[PDB]
Design a protein around this nucleic acid. Sequence first.
RNA 1: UAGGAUAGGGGCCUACCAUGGUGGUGACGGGUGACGGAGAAUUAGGGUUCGAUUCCGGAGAGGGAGCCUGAGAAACGGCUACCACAUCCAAGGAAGGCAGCAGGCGCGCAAAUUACCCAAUCCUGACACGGGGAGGUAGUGACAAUAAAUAACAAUACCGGGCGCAUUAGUGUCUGGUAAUUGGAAUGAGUACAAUCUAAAUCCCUUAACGAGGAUCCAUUGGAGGGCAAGUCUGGUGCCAGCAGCCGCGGUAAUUCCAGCUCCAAUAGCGUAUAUUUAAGUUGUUGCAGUUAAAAAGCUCGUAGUUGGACCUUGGGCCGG
Lengths: 187, 142, 200, 138, 130, 60
Amino acid sequence: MPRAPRTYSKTYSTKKPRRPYEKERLDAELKLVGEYGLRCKRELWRVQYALSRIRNNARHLLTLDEKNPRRIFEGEALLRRMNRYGLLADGQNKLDYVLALTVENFLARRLQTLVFKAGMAKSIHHARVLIRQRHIRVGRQIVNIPSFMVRVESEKHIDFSLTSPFGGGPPGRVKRKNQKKASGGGG
Amino acid sequence: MGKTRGMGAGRKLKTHRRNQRWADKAYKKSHLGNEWKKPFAGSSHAKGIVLEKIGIEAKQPNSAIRKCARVQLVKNGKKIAAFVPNDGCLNFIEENDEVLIAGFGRKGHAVGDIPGVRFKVVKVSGVSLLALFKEKKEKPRS
Amino acid sequence: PLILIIRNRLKYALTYREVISILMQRHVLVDGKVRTDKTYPAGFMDVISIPKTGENYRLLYDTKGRFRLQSVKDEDAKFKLCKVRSVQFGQKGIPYLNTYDGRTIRYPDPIIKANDTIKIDLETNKIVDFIKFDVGNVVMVTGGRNTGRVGVIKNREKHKGSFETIHVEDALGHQFATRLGNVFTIGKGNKPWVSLPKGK
Amino acid sequence: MADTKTAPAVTLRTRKFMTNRLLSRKQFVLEVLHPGRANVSKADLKEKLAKLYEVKDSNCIFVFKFRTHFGGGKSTGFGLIYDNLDAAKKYEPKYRLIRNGLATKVEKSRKQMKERKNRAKKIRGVKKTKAGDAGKKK
Amino acid sequence: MVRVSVLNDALKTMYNAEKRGKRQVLIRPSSKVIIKFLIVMQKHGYIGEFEFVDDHRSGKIVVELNGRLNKCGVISPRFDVGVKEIESWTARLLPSRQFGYIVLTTSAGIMDHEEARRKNVGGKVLGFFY
Amino acid sequence: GKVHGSLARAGKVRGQTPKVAKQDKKKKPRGRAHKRMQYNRRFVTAVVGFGKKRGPNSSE
RNA sequence: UAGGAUAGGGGCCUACCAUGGUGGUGACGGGUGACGGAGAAUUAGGGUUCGAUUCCGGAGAGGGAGCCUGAGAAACGGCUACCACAUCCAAGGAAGGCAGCAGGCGCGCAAAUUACCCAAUCCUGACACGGGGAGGUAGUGACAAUAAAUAACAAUACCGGGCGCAUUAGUGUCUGGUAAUUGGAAUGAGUACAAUCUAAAUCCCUUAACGAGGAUCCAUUGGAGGGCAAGUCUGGUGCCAGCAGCCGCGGUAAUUCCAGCUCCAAUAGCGUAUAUUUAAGUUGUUGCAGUUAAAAAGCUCGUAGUUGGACCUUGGGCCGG
């Protein structure tokens, strides 16, 4: 038939502060935001939501009896979804760590921090700009999005994109005007 | 003392439970229909027309003239008093304009320190009260 | 129903409403006969086969239990396995042996019951074989979650008011029992057609 | 792929292809890499293309439904090569035909179209005499 | 009433006393609690005195404690019979956190929490062993 | 008692203070950019930290 | 019990006949933005609240009754009648129902264009082939939500806080920033050949030529007594003016006012109101309290209702895996 519209359902939780201004909470959150190079606490809230919901599914399987049909079958999916992304390292595959986890693992696997880790940026603030500057990509098709969430598979592939300098052909506008003035104008 | 635990006896617990809710303010508002008794219909805001500017004296150890205005709702016959916050604003309101009022955050009831003032003024003349005192915007002529 | 099934073959992009041109030029035939009706009732074991330079298909089930194509042999296409959905019984030898798509086929075999299945050809509607509904036979469950599973009949349970449940031994998992209407027998010791992995 | 100039090739690639003997034609996906370059063009496609599959006409063949993604250097559309000019039209929807050049889009006015049919029902007889009738009658 | 709760309540207050038993009258759902205690070794012995001629049945307990630590830290009732509050094998509310067990009368008979759960059969909780 | 009080006195304080428009000063970069600054300021060389944290102090 | 009716049983109605039916397990009556459901919000859970909504089933189509045709309508963009409304006229008569779609008025706190197409979703027709404001199409749209621009990085300059050095003076090095200075880079906020795409167009898509010196291509709304994150600032007001959900402040050196500065803090979003969920175990199933705080009926009998002991073909023994 003719279809309906779009629901959505919450992407984030800002529910976590019991008290809106807590000095301890503010200090801790801002440090994470600084190190990984998020701009906003909104970006923290969405990843916090992702952590909680993924963990919530895991709790249900483990509390139930061993060799319960849901536990074994769904447990295969539970293990691999995290592992594929690189969220869950091998060796931590006890299923105890899936319950535990950390906020940090998600941010670590994002593209933005990977740029800085592999030299290049000389600031995590600079790493945020670099993706917008069209530098670095898995394939050919530019990522300007810091939250790309690299698989570890696609980590290997990260090198400059086909466009922009260091990648090849075009330098961009600032040099183009400077060289034009230099060769006809004398600057 | 302890509550009945029993297969049929479920019914006793259910019937009593409903009565208790009426003590709680939120349920009481709906159940009695106290919202209707309060001047608003249940609306977010309500509009009235300014009868007078009235100078209501502050209660007990506070001394000051609060400076309010009484509006009569367009919907109802009900006359009630609403506070005009901020420096000036007694001038900005004026008799016979349309004023949009909302509650204090008291959820009905008089505020306390201003006797019988159930509401406060959100805007006058369609402009925004906030803009006018601040001098961000100016009232339109007429 | 026909429109969904045809579209499954076509779906790359931008057909769908243009199914109509194909139908009216009669380059779709279903069971060797012209139908251009989307609302057409279909069930398990319908044969689709189109003219001349064509192909042959058997309707099968996916994980949900919706109709999907599998290629089938030209030899098998000539035949069709049809549930006897309802029956007009006995005397003077005038059965109306209803099928799921609504075909009638006429006149005694030395048997005939409701829930038994009749093996039919395709075009002429003559009786190839008659398949009894009995224990040990191979079954497809047509509806529910359990759809797309096949198994052998453990027992049938008969009761007052209706025969409530018929039990199937096999499953990916373990035994389940279903209503008679859900059970469509698709194989017997006398004649099976079953040589197919299935569904889920 | 895709003939070069100095300005890079802009790849001519095909993918997910079934020849379907009902629709009587070739349906396939055109995933055009555009490394360092803009738009391939509706013309440049059907000008290469043609000579690979050996349909050897731009006229019968249509390419459409470009959308894309962010990040650049690729675009995805869909294109078909048809067995005959006459055959193609019947299977194709009208929207393909009009842009291709095979059909003209007729613009209509809703008010003019529907009301006019009702008028035809109402008059019985020649009804020329009614015009003269009204003049006399006032 | 049904006894059951009375045994559990009497047990824990008697532990605080440091008595070697209290001895009392017993019934048939309170025959059950004692045998379950033996299995999970809160009791290493129980004896059912005068259940032969008398007006009632009874049982003096010989009970663990008078040792170092108490074995039964808490047992406290969680509803007798004559009520509808019900659990299934999947519903499982619990006390303790797996150190204890949750006493369950199942379809076949009274068994401990793990046994019932494995078999995939629900029932109604009698009490909470911590 | 008094509920028929004077209306004369409205708006005294603003008219006894001289109005002062805001000044042009070196603008902090805004939106996302302002947020970036905050973590570096408070955790590296800090700011003030009498009691909790402080900023716009003179005489203490 | 009988009959007529209708597709049919049928108090369905109607004759005769009997005198019943139903209720504390809350019937009967009243109220209800009381459609019902799938579902929604919010709750760990348990629950609570909600259900106008592109679906599913029914009802109605100005209010009411009655009926034709036909497979089927007790139809309403059919009729027929009355009532209520409004419309037109050469005033005798006549036509008609936007709780369909645009549009307009009124109402109100409150909700958009008198554009276009049958190409897709799907239907209907004598019919591949037509038609369908269903539906799609574009506009408007911070109900909501998603992706995430407004600048980054080096150098350099003081200022540090490091560190190796610091012996010995020092500052010095990775750099945190306070630097409207600087330096070359780079990108899209913008702009625009080309063609794409949509029914046809616009957009998405792009991509030649273009597009930043921070004041410009410049973010905002709230807050800084407590609750509540962040001043005992500066100037002014002085129980005045205001602030203040609540507790409170203002009677002249007010961290609570009013401006400025500075700071905090969410950030293309934030305030405010009403309803609602949580908190609230203030609804106590999960999970309450009643000596003295809100709260055992004066007492007993005692029902509907709940609840209720034990023996009870149950217990034991053997092997197999």
